[PDB]
């Protein structure tokens, strides 16, 4: 382990729209032995955490919010996007000793 | 109801020290652990280290040799204390967990 945690670069959506973020291992299918999290980042490098252990959803989060597994990798989908949406969203993958997140994805809510 | 914060010196002086403490409410340090994150302009965001309910810690190996993650249950505060600094450690430094549920403000740092 010493791996790197990749996520789509950005990705633009409408109000009422369904997308889905993804995020991969380069050493291989993601289990739920990485807890995948998901965070995100609002304007004015505030932090909320969405999603923990795979698909866990922190308490106060929207319902349209929701993690998953999805192939080889961990998903973030958000059923029913909103303007509010717009962000950059991380993804930590815990690997044998450390955490490690994602580059991040810029989240366009047009 | 569960608030974090950080709470750091912003300025610092190239191979001084580094102080920055975590205020914690709405739990108990004694169940969560939690984490140490920077993330500096030009994107990045790493994990630094994290300390569990049990005093147990863990580190990131590029950085290991210069941190070091310490607590006070009973005053519900993580310290944070790294050395060495330079340029590369200006950063927005934030302490978090309940496996990142919650965040907090974060605290500036500029070297030199």
């Known amino acids: 382990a010493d791996a790197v945690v990749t996520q789509e670069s950005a990705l633009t959506t409408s109000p009422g729209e369904t997308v889905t973020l993804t995020c991969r291992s380069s050493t291989g299918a993601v289990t739920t032995s990485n807890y995948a999290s998901w965070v995100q980042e609002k304007p004015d490098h505030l932090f909320t955490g969405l999603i923990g252990?795979?698909?866990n959803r922190a308490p106060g989060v929207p319902a349209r919010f929701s993690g998953s597994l999805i192939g080889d990798k961990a998903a973030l989908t958000i059923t029913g996007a909103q303007t509010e949406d717009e962000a950059i969203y991380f993804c930590?993958?815990?690997?044998?000793?450390?955490?490690?997140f994602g580059g991040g994805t810029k989240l366009t809510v047009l | 109801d569960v608030q974090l914060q950080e709470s750091g010196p912003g300025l610092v002086a190239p191979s001084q020290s580094l102080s920055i403490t975590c205020t914690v409410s709405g739990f108990s340090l004694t169940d969560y652990g939690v984490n140490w994150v920077r993330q500096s302009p030009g994107k990045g965001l790493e994990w630094l280290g994290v300390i569990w309910g049990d005093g147990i810690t863990d580190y990131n190996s590029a950085l290991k040799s210069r941190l070091s993650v310490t607590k006070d249950n009973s005053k519900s505060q993580v310290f944070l204390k790294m050395n060495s600094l330079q340029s590369g450690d200006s950063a927005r430094y934030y302490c978090?967990?309940?496996?990142?549920?919650?965040w907090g403000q974060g605290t500036t740092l500029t070297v030199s």
């Open positions: 930590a993958l815990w690997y044998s000793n450390h955490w490690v």
């Open positions: 978090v967990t309940g496996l990142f549920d919650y």
């Open positions: 252990g795979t698909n």
